[PDB]
Amino acid sequence: MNLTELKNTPVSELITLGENMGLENLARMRKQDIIFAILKQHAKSGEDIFGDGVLEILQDGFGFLRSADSSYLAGPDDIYVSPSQIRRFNLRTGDTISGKIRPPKEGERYFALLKVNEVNFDKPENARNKILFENLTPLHANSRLRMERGNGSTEDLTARVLDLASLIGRGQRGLIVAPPKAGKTMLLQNIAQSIAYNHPDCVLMVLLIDERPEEVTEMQRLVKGEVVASTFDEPASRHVQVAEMVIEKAKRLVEHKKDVIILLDSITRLARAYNTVVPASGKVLTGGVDANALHRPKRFFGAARNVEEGGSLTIIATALIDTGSKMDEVIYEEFKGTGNMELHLSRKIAEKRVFPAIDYNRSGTRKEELLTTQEELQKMWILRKIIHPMGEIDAMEFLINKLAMTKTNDDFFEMMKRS
Amino acid sequence: MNLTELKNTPVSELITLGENMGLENLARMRKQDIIFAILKQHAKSGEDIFGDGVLEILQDGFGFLRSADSSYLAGPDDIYVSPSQIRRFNLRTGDTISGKIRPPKEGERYFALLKVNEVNFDKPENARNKILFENLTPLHANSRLRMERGNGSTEDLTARVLDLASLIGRGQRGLIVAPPKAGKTMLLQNIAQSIAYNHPDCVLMVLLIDERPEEVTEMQRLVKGEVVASTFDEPASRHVQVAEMVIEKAKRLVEHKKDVIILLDSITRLARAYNTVVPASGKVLTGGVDANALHRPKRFFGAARNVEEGGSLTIIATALIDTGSKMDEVIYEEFKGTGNMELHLSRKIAEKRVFPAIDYNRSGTRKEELLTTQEELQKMWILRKIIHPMGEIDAMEFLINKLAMTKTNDDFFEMMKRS
Amino acid sequence: TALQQAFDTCQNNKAAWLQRKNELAAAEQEYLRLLSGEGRNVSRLDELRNIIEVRKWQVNQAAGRYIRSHEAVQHISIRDRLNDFMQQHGTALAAALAPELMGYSELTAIARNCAIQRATDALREALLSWLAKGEKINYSAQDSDILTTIGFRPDVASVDDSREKFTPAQNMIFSRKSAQLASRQSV
């Protein structure tokens, strides 16, 4: 069978399956221990079995094949990858490997692979001849990524607001900054649902840094696309390595002319984790952050681009402000002008409880002409001109009042232009 | 087989040539590694190979030779330069060197030089007998550097406004002060187009600091002169390295009575990089900037001068204001009166989407009498007198209307004086 | 041979404009077909909206270029025919308008312009009288066949597609979008 087939199963189905087959004790072990035990037994049974995962190279060329189902935790369930095939088939980090797998040899704690027959959703001989991600020439985003579901849902209005606030482009790089208790998580879920409901073809990835577990469990039961989240219990080293794994996976997927969308929460937390992990370079700036500490998050955030021949990587990240710690302010200042998309949330809008708490006047998208057709550029320009002088709380009140009564964005535009 | 010509060709042709030359893989690594493999294979074939580039001097004569195609990135494609050759032909940083190149022997992995056959686009013997840029007496700018394209296009309108706002000549030291999203990028585009179109003789180079990769690609694929850019992904050390390389190359070129033009975007980002790379001197000013940290950028911006002996060096560096970060206006205060030409842009005009958004009253040049003639000087004087009272938005609307009515600058002046 | 150059350039402009209208109609039809289908290709829908907008702009520009080319070829034909007819009958034409003509022969600039204006409005009422009695007018043989090939006036499909104007900002943004479309078609 496939490893993901029995790894994703609940603990109750796994316990019943382990007891039915007849292994002695199964109660006091983790997912990984039970999976390893049952897989070892099925290996000594003699039947042919398969395996799945994504590849990683250690500092000494040692290959580990993780799986995204288990939130990329490191354990013996990860598949052995000897240097022989990492050199023979020139694999690298972020590659997905599937094919014949091998029981662990006596003295080896890791299941091995006999051979590979499917890599990166393509035949192996074609996957070898590709183009490196950094060898591609970036572009401005031109393919519109509409967020309005059009089903007339209660939460869809929120998404509609974004379609009026800041444009979304395929392969665009963006930031949404918000103070605590402003609705970041709800907006992230709305974005994920819109992606899964309007553009099922594009690959959707959600990443959560050191988030408390209940929202994580909500994400695994709310978003159609796979979500990788590490709780704050795990150390910062795990945070940075899982971020590197996710970005490398996205780069490898984009290498095959496949659209990839990444939702990040939060980039400030990732920067803090990197500052914790990266050794001090002797130049500590204000806020107790190393000069080279923010270099890696800048690379991660700037990996988003749009390619000539096809494929694109869209990254939307959240940055925390007004949290009381001014090192977060320093991080936000360092990330002030990097993103094409700039969206702002404020506490004062959320105090009056109108949702989404979007600051319309100071939020926008640069180079938006290439994204959509002109006539709605003038429509949104008229709307922005008539909403700019008046206050933000009243702006949200007016927008929700005149948007709830309509049906779609074009209906809103026609209703506003007739009046 | 020139190294530069194979660098110009895209990656696909490199991979095709490698496959045709009996080289395996060479598809999942960076451009520099592919070029290194191709050059090694060609050297093993036995034919003579030659190259070119720009010199760099390390702290102990460990000389390197970079290429402007790769934005002066340190990679395997760089060419070794021994101290013996440096002491023999009297080289220094910024020298343009072309000649024979040598495959590496055992123990080293960098190409050497068999012999040099062109230094600074000149015979090596005549290159040694050149006066330093620091020993050349500066003067005020004499030759006017007209920006009017004259082809009767519609974007040239912006360039025409330049000829009405601030005169630019050979050796100007100019600052473009602008808020975010005011038209800096395509104003620089128009300036570069005018330089490459009206003045093909002068050397034009565009330096970009911590700019987004898409803007870098847009810059490279439009301008005629060679362009160098470092994205925000790279650390500030590379920003400093690239700026120093550009200024040294410009000094070496202008030492040969050449006209060099540099466009910098932005001097604020370069100042930030110098501040975060230079060790602290124990005296920090407002905004977290070290006292001597701004000494280095000023030198870069202080090289703009008109050499009496021959040639000139013009620098047009843009500056950011009203960005919400105190460091930016601290740097602007430290750079207020240092430049002899100023071009002020305002977000107020750009809000109404009237372009170019130029604060005409604040923008100007210093002692332009040495640049232009007299009768058109009084034409500009009376134009300024009649455009002084009304506000900047009304002034720009009137200016663009009148300029669209006429065809050329002389036609505009005659239409203004006849009415 | 300048007349032949104007003629075949006008023919090329006609062909290009007809072609552009052809793919504009094809794109509009396919967009409407996707609207008819239930399948939600929303990304393809926005892409098709962009395509139809940029191709409408291209059709407008091609129609305008056709209009200018047609005007240029008609002006060249007028120049040639009027020139040789006037070379034929200039003695009598100047005899009819002796005063102002020989005044322009030697006078001040303002007086010369006044004489030209008097000649022009004299021929004004002459031509108005001729067209008032209203005979039938025909071309000249070679120009007759050329201008029957190109027609008396450009097609109404060429004028109704140029009745709308574009601001220069729209002009170069649409040029960039058309270049991006060409690159996409190359892919």
Ligand SMILES: Nc1ncnc2c1ncn2[C@@H]1O[C@H](COP(=O)(O)OP(=O)(O)OP(O)(O)=S)[C@@H](O)[C@H]1O
């Ligand atoms: N569109 C929305 N509709 C209804 N309730 C919303 C909406 N957006 C936010 N809320 C409410 O706002 C509150 C905060 O939501 P969260 O997204 O969890 O806040 P947050 O931005 O994640 O800040 P943290 O993570 O708690 S520090 C909750 O009570 C939500 O129910």
Ligand SMILES: Nc1ncnc2c1ncn2[C@@H]1O[C@H](COP(=O)(O)OP(=O)(O)OP(O)(O)=S)[C@@H](O)[C@H]1O
């Ligand atoms: N001459 C012009 N003609 C038409 N549109 C213009 C002109 N100048 C500016 N614009 C518009 O104004 C904006 C200028 O964009 P950019 O020049 O990229 O901004 P910027 O000055 O580079 O600041 P950044 O780097 O984006 S924060 C775009 O939306 C352009 O469409």
Ligand SMILES: [Mg+2]
């Ligand atoms: Mg949250």
Ligand SMILES: [Mg+2]
């Ligand atoms: Mg810019």
